[PDB]
Design a protein around this ligand. Sequence first.
Ligand SMILES: [Mg+2]
Ligand SMILES: [Mg+2]
Ligand SMILES: [Mg+2]
Ligand SMILES: [Mg+2]
Ligand SMILES: [Mg+2]
Ligand SMILES: [Mg+2]
Ligand SMILES: [Mg+2]
Ligand SMILES: [Mg+2]
Ligand SMILES: [Mg+2]
Ligand SMILES: [Mg+2]
Ligand SMILES: [Mg+2]
Ligand SMILES: [Mg+2]
Ligand SMILES: [Mg+2]
Ligand SMILES: [Mg+2]
Ligand SMILES: [Mg+2]
Ligand SMILES: [Mg+2]
Ligand SMILES: [Mg+2]
Ligand SMILES: [Mg+2]
Ligand SMILES: [Mg+2]
Ligand SMILES: [Mg+2]
Ligand SMILES: [Mg+2]
Ligand SMILES: [Mg+2]
Ligand SMILES: [Mg+2]
Ligand SMILES: [Mg+2]
Ligand SMILES: [Mg+2]
Ligand SMILES: [Mg+2]
Ligand SMILES: [Mg+2]
Ligand SMILES: [Mg+2]
Ligand SMILES: [Mg+2]
Ligand SMILES: [Mg+2]
Ligand SMILES: [Mg+2]
Ligand SMILES: [Mg+2]
Ligand SMILES: [Mg+2]
Ligand SMILES: [Mg+2]
Ligand SMILES: [Mg+2]
Ligand SMILES: [Mg+2]
Ligand SMILES: [Mg+2]
Ligand SMILES: [Mg+2]
Ligand SMILES: [Mg+2]
Ligand SMILES: [Mg+2]
Ligand SMILES: [Mg+2]
Ligand SMILES: [Mg+2]
Ligand SMILES: [Mg+2]
Ligand SMILES: [Mg+2]
Ligand SMILES: [Mg+2]
Ligand SMILES: [Mg+2]
Ligand SMILES: [Mg+2]
Ligand SMILES: [Mg+2]
Ligand SMILES: [Mg+2]
Ligand SMILES: [Mg+2]
Ligand SMILES: [Mg+2]
Ligand SMILES: [Mg+2]
Ligand SMILES: [Mg+2]
Ligand SMILES: [Mg+2]
Ligand SMILES: [Mg+2]
Ligand SMILES: [Mg+2]
Ligand SMILES: [Mg+2]
Ligand SMILES: [Mg+2]
Ligand SMILES: [Mg+2]
Ligand SMILES: [Mg+2]
Ligand SMILES: [Mg+2]
Ligand SMILES: [Mg+2]
Ligand SMILES: [Mg+2]
Ligand SMILES: [Mg+2]
Ligand SMILES: [Mg+2]
Ligand SMILES: [Mg+2]
Ligand SMILES: [Mg+2]
Ligand SMILES: [Mg+2]
Ligand SMILES: [Mg+2]
Ligand SMILES: [Mg+2]
Ligand SMILES: [Mg+2]
Ligand SMILES: [Mg+2]
Ligand SMILES: [Mg+2]
Ligand SMILES: [Mg+2]
Ligand SMILES: [Mg+2]
Ligand SMILES: [Mg+2]
Ligand SMILES: [Mg+2]
Ligand SMILES: [Mg+2]
Ligand SMILES: [Mg+2]
Ligand SMILES: [Mg+2]
Ligand SMILES: [Mg+2]
Ligand SMILES: [Mg+2]
Ligand SMILES: [Mg+2]
Ligand SMILES: [Mg+2]
Ligand SMILES: [Mg+2]
Ligand SMILES: [Mg+2]
Ligand SMILES: [Mg+2]
Ligand SMILES: [Mg+2]
Ligand SMILES: [Mg+2]
Ligand SMILES: [Mg+2]
Ligand SMILES: [Mg+2]
Ligand SMILES: [Mg+2]
Ligand SMILES: [Mg+2]
Ligand SMILES: [Mg+2]
Ligand SMILES: [Mg+2]
Ligand SMILES: [Mg+2]
Ligand SMILES: [Mg+2]
Ligand SMILES: [Mg+2]
Ligand SMILES: [Mg+2]
Ligand SMILES: [Mg+2]
Ligand SMILES: [Mg+2]
Ligand SMILES: [Mg+2]
Ligand SMILES: [Mg+2]
Ligand SMILES: [Mg+2]
Ligand SMILES: [Mg+2]
Ligand SMILES: [Mg+2]
Ligand SMILES: [Mg+2]
Ligand SMILES: [Mg+2]
Ligand SMILES: [Mg+2]
Ligand SMILES: [Mg+2]
Ligand SMILES: [Mg+2]
Ligand SMILES: [Mg+2]
Ligand SMILES: [Mg+2]
Ligand SMILES: [Mg+2]
Ligand SMILES: [Mg+2]
Ligand SMILES: [Mg+2]
Ligand SMILES: [Mg+2]
Ligand SMILES: [Mg+2]
Ligand SMILES: [Mg+2]
Ligand SMILES: [Mg+2]
Ligand SMILES: [Mg+2]
Ligand SMILES: [Mg+2]
Ligand SMILES: [Mg+2]
Ligand SMILES: [Mg+2]
Ligand SMILES: [Mg+2]
Ligand SMILES: [Mg+2]
Ligand SMILES: [Mg+2]
Ligand SMILES: [Mg+2]
Ligand SMILES: [Mg+2]
Ligand SMILES: [Mg+2]
Ligand SMILES: [Mg+2]
Ligand SMILES: [Mg+2]
Ligand SMILES: [Mg+2]
Ligand SMILES: [Mg+2]
Ligand SMILES: [Mg+2]
Ligand SMILES: [Mg+2]
Ligand SMILES: [Mg+2]
Ligand SMILES: [Mg+2]
Ligand SMILES: [Mg+2]
Ligand SMILES: [Mg+2]
Ligand SMILES: [Mg+2]
Ligand SMILES: [Mg+2]
Ligand SMILES: [Mg+2]
Ligand SMILES: [Mg+2]
Ligand SMILES: [Mg+2]
Ligand SMILES: [Mg+2]
Ligand SMILES: [Mg+2]
Ligand SMILES: [Mg+2]
Ligand SMILES: [Mg+2]
Ligand SMILES: [Mg+2]
Ligand SMILES: [Mg+2]
Ligand SMILES: [Mg+2]
Ligand SMILES: [Mg+2]
Ligand SMILES: [Mg+2]
Ligand SMILES: [Mg+2]
Ligand SMILES: [Mg+2]
Ligand SMILES: [Mg+2]
Ligand SMILES: [Mg+2]
Ligand SMILES: [Mg+2]
Ligand SMILES: [Mg+2]
Ligand SMILES: [Mg+2]
Ligand SMILES: [Mg+2]
Ligand SMILES: [Mg+2]
Ligand SMILES: [Mg+2]
Ligand SMILES: [Mg+2]
Ligand SMILES: [Mg+2]
Ligand SMILES: [Mg+2]
Ligand SMILES: [Mg+2]
Ligand SMILES: [Mg+2]
Ligand SMILES: [Mg+2]
Ligand SMILES: [Mg+2]
Ligand SMILES: [Mg+2]
Ligand SMILES: [Mg+2]
Ligand SMILES: [Mg+2]
Ligand SMILES: [Mg+2]
Ligand SMILES: [Mg+2]
Ligand SMILES: [Mg+2]
Ligand SMILES: [Mg+2]
Ligand SMILES: [Mg+2]
Ligand SMILES: [Mg+2]
Ligand SMILES: [Mg+2]
Ligand SMILES: [Mg+2]
Ligand SMILES: [Mg+2]
Ligand SMILES: [Mg+2]
Ligand SMILES: [Mg+2]
Ligand SMILES: [Mg+2]
Ligand SMILES: [Mg+2]
Ligand SMILES: [Mg+2]
Ligand SMILES: [Mg+2]
Ligand SMILES: [Mg+2]
Ligand SMILES: [Mg+2]
Ligand SMILES: [Mg+2]
Ligand SMILES: [Mg+2]
Ligand SMILES: [Zn+2]
Lengths: 131, 12, 122, 118, 204, 59
Amino acid sequence: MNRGALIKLVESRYVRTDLPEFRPGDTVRVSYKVKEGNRTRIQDFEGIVIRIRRNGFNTTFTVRKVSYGVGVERIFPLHSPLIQKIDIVQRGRARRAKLYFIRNLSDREIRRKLRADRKRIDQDRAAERAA
Amino acid sequence: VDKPPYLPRPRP
Amino acid sequence: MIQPQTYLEVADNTGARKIMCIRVLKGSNAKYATVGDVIVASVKEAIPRGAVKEGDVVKAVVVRTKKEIKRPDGSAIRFDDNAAVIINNQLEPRGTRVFGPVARELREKGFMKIVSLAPEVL
Amino acid sequence: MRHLKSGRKLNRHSSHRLALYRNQAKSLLTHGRITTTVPKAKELRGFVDHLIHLAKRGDLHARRLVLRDLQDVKLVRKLFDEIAPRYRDRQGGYTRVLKLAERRRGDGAPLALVELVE
Amino acid sequence: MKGILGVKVGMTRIFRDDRAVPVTVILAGPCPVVQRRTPEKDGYTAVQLGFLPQNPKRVNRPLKGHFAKAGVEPVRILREIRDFNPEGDTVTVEIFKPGERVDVTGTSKGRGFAGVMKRWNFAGGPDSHGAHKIHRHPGSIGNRKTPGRVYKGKKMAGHYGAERVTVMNLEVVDVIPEENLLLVKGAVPGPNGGLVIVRETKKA
Amino acid sequence: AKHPVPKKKTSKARRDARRSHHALTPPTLVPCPECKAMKPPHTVCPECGYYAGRKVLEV
RNA sequence: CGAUGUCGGCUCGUCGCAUCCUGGGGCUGAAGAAGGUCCCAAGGGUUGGGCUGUUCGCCCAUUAAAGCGGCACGCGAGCUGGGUUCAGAACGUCGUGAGACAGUUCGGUCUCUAUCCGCCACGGGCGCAGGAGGCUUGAGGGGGGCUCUUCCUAGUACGAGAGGACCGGAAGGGACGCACCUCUGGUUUCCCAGCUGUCCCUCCAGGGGCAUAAGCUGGGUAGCCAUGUGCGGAAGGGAUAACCGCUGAAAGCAUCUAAGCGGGAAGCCCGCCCCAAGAUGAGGCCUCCCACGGCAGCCGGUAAGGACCCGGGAAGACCACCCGGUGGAUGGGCCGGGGGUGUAAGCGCCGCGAGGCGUUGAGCCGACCGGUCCCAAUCGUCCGAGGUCU
RNA sequence: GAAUGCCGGCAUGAGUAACGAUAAAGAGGGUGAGAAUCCCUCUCGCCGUAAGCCCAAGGGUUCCUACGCAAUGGUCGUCAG
RNA sequence: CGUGAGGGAAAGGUGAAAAGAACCCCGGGAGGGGAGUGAAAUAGAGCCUGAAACCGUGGGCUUACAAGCAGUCACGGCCCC
Ligand SMILES: [Mg+2]
Ligand SMILES: [Mg+2]
Ligand SMILES: [Mg+2]
Ligand SMILES: [Mg+2]
Ligand SMILES: [Mg+2]
Ligand SMILES: [Mg+2]
Ligand SMILES: [Mg+2]
Ligand SMILES: [Mg+2]
Ligand SMILES: [Mg+2]
Ligand SMILES: [Mg+2]
Ligand SMILES: [Mg+2]
Ligand SMILES: [Mg+2]
Ligand SMILES: [Mg+2]
Ligand SMILES: [Mg+2]
Ligand SMILES: [Mg+2]
Ligand SMILES: [Mg+2]
Ligand SMILES: [Mg+2]
Ligand SMILES: [Mg+2]
Ligand SMILES: [Mg+2]
Ligand SMILES: [Mg+2]
Ligand SMILES: [Mg+2]
Ligand SMILES: [Mg+2]
Ligand SMILES: [Mg+2]
Ligand SMILES: [Mg+2]
Ligand SMILES: [Mg+2]
Ligand SMILES: [Mg+2]
Ligand SMILES: [Mg+2]
Ligand SMILES: [Mg+2]
Ligand SMILES: [Mg+2]
Ligand SMILES: [Mg+2]
Ligand SMILES: [Mg+2]
Ligand SMILES: [Mg+2]
Ligand SMILES: [Mg+2]
Ligand SMILES: [Mg+2]
Ligand SMILES: [Mg+2]
Ligand SMILES: [Mg+2]
Ligand SMILES: [Mg+2]
Ligand SMILES: [Mg+2]
Ligand SMILES: [Mg+2]
Ligand SMILES: [Mg+2]
Ligand SMILES: [Mg+2]
Ligand SMILES: [Mg+2]
Ligand SMILES: [Mg+2]
Ligand SMILES: [Mg+2]
Ligand SMILES: [Mg+2]
Ligand SMILES: [Mg+2]
Ligand SMILES: [Mg+2]
Ligand SMILES: [Mg+2]
Ligand SMILES: [Mg+2]
Ligand SMILES: [Mg+2]
Ligand SMILES: [Mg+2]
Ligand SMILES: [Mg+2]
Ligand SMILES: [Mg+2]
Ligand SMILES: [Mg+2]
Ligand SMILES: [Mg+2]
Ligand SMILES: [Mg+2]
Ligand SMILES: [Mg+2]
Ligand SMILES: [Mg+2]
Ligand SMILES: [Mg+2]
Ligand SMILES: [Mg+2]
Ligand SMILES: [Mg+2]
Ligand SMILES: [Mg+2]
Ligand SMILES: [Mg+2]
Ligand SMILES: [Mg+2]
Ligand SMILES: [Mg+2]
Ligand SMILES: [Mg+2]
Ligand SMILES: [Mg+2]
Ligand SMILES: [Mg+2]
Ligand SMILES: [Mg+2]
Ligand SMILES: [Mg+2]
Ligand SMILES: [Mg+2]
Ligand SMILES: [Mg+2]
Ligand SMILES: [Mg+2]
Ligand SMILES: [Mg+2]
Ligand SMILES: [Mg+2]
Ligand SMILES: [Mg+2]
Ligand SMILES: [Mg+2]
Ligand SMILES: [Mg+2]
Ligand SMILES: [Mg+2]
Ligand SMILES: [Mg+2]
Ligand SMILES: [Mg+2]
Ligand SMILES: [Mg+2]
Ligand SMILES: [Mg+2]
Ligand SMILES: [Mg+2]
Ligand SMILES: [Mg+2]
Ligand SMILES: [Mg+2]
Ligand SMILES: [Mg+2]
Ligand SMILES: [Mg+2]
Ligand SMILES: [Mg+2]
Ligand SMILES: [Mg+2]
Ligand SMILES: [Mg+2]
Ligand SMILES: [Mg+2]
Ligand SMILES: [Mg+2]
Ligand SMILES: [Mg+2]
Ligand SMILES: [Mg+2]
Ligand SMILES: [Mg+2]
Ligand SMILES: [Mg+2]
Ligand SMILES: [Mg+2]
Ligand SMILES: [Mg+2]
Ligand SMILES: [Mg+2]
Ligand SMILES: [Mg+2]
Ligand SMILES: [Mg+2]
Ligand SMILES: [Mg+2]
Ligand SMILES: [Mg+2]
Ligand SMILES: [Mg+2]
Ligand SMILES: [Mg+2]
Ligand SMILES: [Mg+2]
Ligand SMILES: [Mg+2]
Ligand SMILES: [Mg+2]
Ligand SMILES: [Mg+2]
Ligand SMILES: [Mg+2]
Ligand SMILES: [Mg+2]
Ligand SMILES: [Mg+2]
Ligand SMILES: [Mg+2]
Ligand SMILES: [Mg+2]
Ligand SMILES: [Mg+2]
Ligand SMILES: [Mg+2]
Ligand SMILES: [Mg+2]
Ligand SMILES: [Mg+2]
Ligand SMILES: [Mg+2]
Ligand SMILES: [Mg+2]
Ligand SMILES: [Mg+2]
Ligand SMILES: [Mg+2]
Ligand SMILES: [Mg+2]
Ligand SMILES: [Mg+2]
Ligand SMILES: [Mg+2]
Ligand SMILES: [Mg+2]
Ligand SMILES: [Mg+2]
Ligand SMILES: [Mg+2]
Ligand SMILES: [Mg+2]
Ligand SMILES: [Mg+2]
Ligand SMILES: [Mg+2]
Ligand SMILES: [Mg+2]
Ligand SMILES: [Mg+2]
Ligand SMILES: [Mg+2]
Ligand SMILES: [Mg+2]
Ligand SMILES: [Mg+2]
Ligand SMILES: [Mg+2]
Ligand SMILES: [Mg+2]
Ligand SMILES: [Mg+2]
Ligand SMILES: [Mg+2]
Ligand SMILES: [Mg+2]
Ligand SMILES: [Mg+2]
Ligand SMILES: [Mg+2]
Ligand SMILES: [Mg+2]
Ligand SMILES: [Mg+2]
Ligand SMILES: [Mg+2]
Ligand SMILES: [Mg+2]
Ligand SMILES: [Mg+2]
Ligand SMILES: [Mg+2]
Ligand SMILES: [Mg+2]
Ligand SMILES: [Mg+2]
Ligand SMILES: [Mg+2]
Ligand SMILES: [Mg+2]
Ligand SMILES: [Mg+2]
Ligand SMILES: [Mg+2]
Ligand SMILES: [Mg+2]
Ligand SMILES: [Mg+2]
Ligand SMILES: [Mg+2]
Ligand SMILES: [Mg+2]
Ligand SMILES: [Mg+2]
Ligand SMILES: [Mg+2]
Ligand SMILES: [Mg+2]
Ligand SMILES: [Mg+2]
Ligand SMILES: [Mg+2]
Ligand SMILES: [Mg+2]
Ligand SMILES: [Mg+2]
Ligand SMILES: [Mg+2]
Ligand SMILES: [Mg+2]
Ligand SMILES: [Mg+2]
Ligand SMILES: [Mg+2]
Ligand SMILES: [Mg+2]
Ligand SMILES: [Mg+2]
Ligand SMILES: [Mg+2]
Ligand SMILES: [Mg+2]
Ligand SMILES: [Mg+2]
Ligand SMILES: [Mg+2]
Ligand SMILES: [Mg+2]
Ligand SMILES: [Mg+2]
Ligand SMILES: [Mg+2]
Ligand SMILES: [Mg+2]
Ligand SMILES: [Mg+2]
Ligand SMILES: [Mg+2]
Ligand SMILES: [Mg+2]
Ligand SMILES: [Mg+2]
Ligand SMILES: [Mg+2]
Ligand SMILES: [Mg+2]
Ligand SMILES: [Mg+2]
Ligand SMILES: [Mg+2]
Ligand SMILES: [Mg+2]
Ligand SMILES: [Mg+2]
Ligand SMILES: [Mg+2]
Ligand SMILES: [Mg+2]
Ligand SMILES: [Zn+2]
């Protein structure tokens, strides 16, 4: 028996494919389904992704933003059904995989450290050309 | 209850 | 994860600035208060001529924590500081405004008045 | 607990243990056959096999990689030129360990021989 | 009181009703009944189950005879489910439906010779303030001349784990008959690849 | 610590009972299929240098 | 008195019940809710802080409650050493003085090795009248045993009003326990990268040692983990405690009792989980081998089987246990995937240059899920029933 | 037959603690009855205001070579003060 | 041993005579086995006698459901004379 194959088999029902690729440093908007009372609605959470854990169906990523003077980080599962869609708002280039260091940096300092990933931007315009 | 020690502490 | 000795930023305009938890009000021996819990706290730092002054022993509900909180949808949320909002014994906020986002858990736990006053709920 | 951990410690700290493996590789790759204690022998296998399998690759990168462990330009040159080619069609298993029958006198340590395969 | 042998395969989580559900996957079926214990013959009621296909080259002659009396191919593991009497000559995962509630028995991971702090959750000693080589020590183990001895069962260091543990009242989240899979909500004893036993729960 | 110490001399009987496990097991040896000499199994024969039906070593 | 170490703390408990809480009751100056008082009950529970060496006590904030005692005022061959008993020094006081003070003050050497019993763990031996491989019954033990809030019943019964139920039914927490690693969060001694000083290879480029037993830094897989996840306390049956009765004499009435029968607790017995036939009272079922030689016995050759040896293992101090040994995927290589790191070296282009861009998610790459006989588990050896007697 | 007597012998604890700085080792060749420990080579590590060098105390042949290994060397020894 | 004044041991025996064991064997040696000496070699130099504790080998009886200042009294089993 193949234990890995059998696990992957269970997971395949829930595996998601509509979500766009992104990297630590990209600025991203996540449309997340949220329940409040007595309805469910879609709230947007948009910030820099500072982390991507990888583990097959169980990869999760972490988006950080400042909200009304307070820093807020969110952790989403990449295959969570409660994510309506993900919108790349900007490609930024980090030299690292995990960007915990930006938690301690001023807005100016961050802007210098996270320059625009010009390569993956033109590359995004290279697609996005419909036939 | 503090009662007086009956032994000295041992010496080398 | 707020426990006795923890300092909390107050996120209202009661005049308090910094409170220090001295008991987490959640049963006979709660170890930590999280989002939506009430604590008893001493006011360690406050602004002049507020409703509340330095030294007062007030109650407050925790509105955001630096230790991330987990949600049944598999996600979680973490804030840059530990914050609370000072309340009266009827769980109503004592200030007239609240500053910064608050955790959605406040709604479920029946703190509607504070949620409605907050600029953002995450 | 040691659950699912790979790699002996051999009562040496990190750098010493590494040196041990490098120097034994140099020794094995130089004489083709060396004698050691059974534990050191077994551990030596993969350490050298990876080096041999890289000599098979031949590229400059591979030479610069293998050179980090072996250091000796002459030796590495022998590895790529003389050694590697006789393993072209062989896929892994370039070394073998065979346990000797007699123990060491001064400490009763069990001995074995490590060698490059034909 | 139904039951089935199986192997723990590993853990993941799935999504049910906007909720993440920690699950352990168990390869349960198929289990051939190779003996039935009867009150007339054995004095109690149970069904001896077999599990996993076995290389007949490894099965000795005493064992071979047993398997033949049941007309069943050689099997790696024999275990009994008590007070269970399936209609069939083979047990599959079908006997559990999602929503049901089960007990899982497994062999806990072995922590070998374990200290008193891991084994028994002792608090040990201080790490400063004068503490002298007793940081993970038990402290007192007794009194004085009365009683002048140590209690049986006195919590002390020693082996821990590699022992039978049964976790109860676990929700069956799904069952995938085509692959002999069982999805149970939460944590099951033992390592992946370890053998488990899945019985109907005795809770209310 | 307060320097624990034996209370009574160990009897000749009790000493010897402790040593009921101290016996040596003779080495396990099989014949070498080439030269018939006895040797540890799974070891290259130190008498003729043969292992797995072939010469491996000078003896 | 040829030594029984002396307060308090820490640690670890265990018992008592004259019960602090929770469970069950009778009386109440018991409307309800809440109290008072006594009876039954030791199953569990009995918080965090400030002061002081303190035990104790006062105080803060909570709580279902913040119980009182025994165990050499339990516990220093378990720790501490703040108190108190040494030698130093000073204050007050006493003494002409040396000195003294249930007066004060600052300081002041706490001993690696466990023989026996006991306790936690793990084996070796023999036994269990044939020898063996599996699977079990459970005598008897052990573990567990907590509790709160809100909501429905119902703003109902009750009460002038405030206030506010019994019974029955839901949801949600605190602490504790067992297990776990999907998530969250740790560690991850070399898995990747960056960096400084120096020595070296080989001058550049690229690299190696050392700076810790990782030079420093940023990350980080498996595993082991808690702050993270699942589940547990029961349900239920039986017998009772105080207490309440049914029927009923002695005693024409009355009486829970003298005959008999009910109801009745977190407690008791079963039930749940774990250990367990050395349960010498050594149990049971399935299956396998057999009437072997020579003289309930001795020697020897076998059978079914087993051990030795070897490759190993979320098993493990040794041992034991589990898997495998070419009839083979057991470890090591190699390959595929995962995973970490985050775009190698080399070349080309731009800048005077530090550098920058491209090739490029590149190169490197522990344990994870797998594939593959490339390397190694070669070859063998030794034990091992002939079945006592009515 | 006892004086924690005296002198000696031999036990026990026990194949137990320990084998004296955590700067560190690995292979090949040689010698020899015997080699992890002696010789040689290569690789690796440690000291370098020393763990290098030169005096003075103090020690008094320990210096050099040949032949040896019973004891001394905390193991071994073909080596050695 | 102590700077020093000073303190202060242990240790006798082959045989009548060395006749002190040539030679051979195993062993690097030590040691031992034969041979030889002697009245005697468990008189062989680690030498007269050679007690006891202490250690071992072989034999007989006995012991793995048993509670002990270890003996003592009775009976029985086994071994010996
Ligand atoms: Mg997996
Ligand atoms: Mg499959
Ligand atoms: Mg919004
Ligand atoms: Mg931002
Ligand atoms: Mg604020
Ligand atoms: Mg003030
Ligand atoms: Mg283990
Ligand atoms: Mg460890
Ligand atoms: Mg492994
Ligand atoms: Mg390594
Ligand atoms: Mg290992
Ligand atoms: Mg190993
Ligand atoms: Mg070493
Ligand atoms: Mg060692
Ligand atoms: Mg080093
Ligand atoms: Mg280092
Ligand atoms: Mg590898
Ligand atoms: Mg071998
Ligand atoms: Mg030697
Ligand atoms: Mg479903
Ligand atoms: Mg099992
Ligand atoms: Mg401990
Ligand atoms: Mg534990
Ligand atoms: Mg713990
Ligand atoms: Mg503690
Ligand atoms: Mg601690
Ligand atoms: Mg402390
Ligand atoms: Mg101390
Ligand atoms: Mg100390
Ligand atoms: Mg310490
Ligand atoms: Mg202790
Ligand atoms: Mg007693
Ligand atoms: Mg075990
Ligand atoms: Mg001590
Ligand atoms: Mg002590
Ligand atoms: Mg001690
Ligand atoms: Mg000490
Ligand atoms: Mg001692
Ligand atoms: Mg004693
Ligand atoms: Mg003795
Ligand atoms: Mg004896
Ligand atoms: Mg003994
Ligand atoms: Mg051997
Ligand atoms: Mg020869
Ligand atoms: Mg006395
Ligand atoms: Mg004495
Ligand atoms: Mg005495
Ligand atoms: Mg009472
Ligand atoms: Mg009550
Ligand atoms: Mg009560
Ligand atoms: Mg009332
Ligand atoms: Mg009233
Ligand atoms: Mg009452
Ligand atoms: Mg109680
Ligand atoms: Mg009790
Ligand atoms: Mg108590
Ligand atoms: Mg304090
Ligand atoms: Mg007081
Ligand atoms: Mg209260
Ligand atoms: Mg009350
Ligand atoms: Mg208190
Ligand atoms: Mg005391
Ligand atoms: Mg006390
Ligand atoms: Mg002490
Ligand atoms: Mg004390
Ligand atoms: Mg004591
Ligand atoms: Mg004490
Ligand atoms: Mg004591
Ligand atoms: Mg003191
Ligand atoms: Mg003081
Ligand atoms: Mg005092
Ligand atoms: Mg004192
Ligand atoms: Mg004093
Ligand atoms: Mg003074
Ligand atoms: Mg005066
Ligand atoms: Mg006076
Ligand atoms: Mg006086
Ligand atoms: Mg006077
Ligand atoms: Mg005077
Ligand atoms: Mg005094
Ligand atoms: Mg001082
Ligand atoms: Mg001293
Ligand atoms: Mg001492
Ligand atoms: Mg002992
Ligand atoms: Mg046993
Ligand atoms: Mg046994
Ligand atoms: Mg078996
Ligand atoms: Mg029982
Ligand atoms: Mg018993
Ligand atoms: Mg109502
Ligand atoms: Mg009314
Ligand atoms: Mg209710
Ligand atoms: Mg509950
Ligand atoms: Mg994981
Ligand atoms: Mg993790
Ligand atoms: Mg994780
Ligand atoms: Mg993590
Ligand atoms: Mg590396
Ligand atoms: Mg350079
Ligand atoms: Mg460098
Ligand atoms: Mg160097
Ligand atoms: Mg250096
Ligand atoms: Mg160093
Ligand atoms: Mg490094
Ligand atoms: Mg980290
Ligand atoms: Mg690091
Ligand atoms: Mg990890
Ligand atoms: Mg926890
Ligand atoms: Mg009941
Ligand atoms: Mg009843
Ligand atoms: Mg009547
Ligand atoms: Mg009656
Ligand atoms: Mg009744
Ligand atoms: Mg009754
Ligand atoms: Mg009734
Ligand atoms: Mg209960
Ligand atoms: Mg069992
Ligand atoms: Mg039995
Ligand atoms: Mg059994
Ligand atoms: Mg009995
Ligand atoms: Mg039996
Ligand atoms: Mg039976
Ligand atoms: Mg056989
Ligand atoms: Mg092993
Ligand atoms: Mg086997
Ligand atoms: Mg074989
Ligand atoms: Mg084979
Ligand atoms: Mg394999
Ligand atoms: Mg493989
Ligand atoms: Mg990948
Ligand atoms: Mg990747
Ligand atoms: Mg580039
Ligand atoms: Mg490049
Ligand atoms: Mg240029
Ligand atoms: Mg790969
Ligand atoms: Mg092969
Ligand atoms: Mg194949
Ligand atoms: Mg053979
Ligand atoms: Mg006398
Ligand atoms: Mg004496
Ligand atoms: Mg004496
Ligand atoms: Mg004495
Ligand atoms: Mg004497
Ligand atoms: Mg005497
Ligand atoms: Mg003496
Ligand atoms: Mg001992
Ligand atoms: Mg020891
Ligand atoms: Mg040792
Ligand atoms: Mg030492
Ligand atoms: Mg040393
Ligand atoms: Mg060190
Ligand atoms: Mg050599
Ligand atoms: Mg040599
Ligand atoms: Mg040597
Ligand atoms: Mg030697
Ligand atoms: Mg210098
Ligand atoms: Mg001179
Ligand atoms: Mg001298
Ligand atoms: Mg001399
Ligand atoms: Mg000279
Ligand atoms: Mg000389
Ligand atoms: Mg010489
Ligand atoms: Mg010598
Ligand atoms: Mg010698
Ligand atoms: Mg010698
Ligand atoms: Mg010596
Ligand atoms: Mg020596
Ligand atoms: Mg010495
Ligand atoms: Mg010399
Ligand atoms: Mg003197
Ligand atoms: Mg002198
Ligand atoms: Mg004198
Ligand atoms: Mg004398
Ligand atoms: Mg004479
Ligand atoms: Mg004479
Ligand atoms: Mg000779
Ligand atoms: Mg000769
Ligand atoms: Mg020689
Ligand atoms: Mg001689
Ligand atoms: Mg001889
Ligand atoms: Mg002779
Ligand atoms: Mg004659
Ligand atoms: Mg005569
Ligand atoms: Mg004689
Ligand atoms: Mg004589
Ligand atoms: Mg004599
Ligand atoms: Mg004479
Ligand atoms: Mg003699
Ligand atoms: Mg004698
Ligand atoms: Mg004997
Ligand atoms: Mg009995
Ligand atoms: Mg008997
Ligand atoms: Mg008799
Ligand atoms: Zn041979």
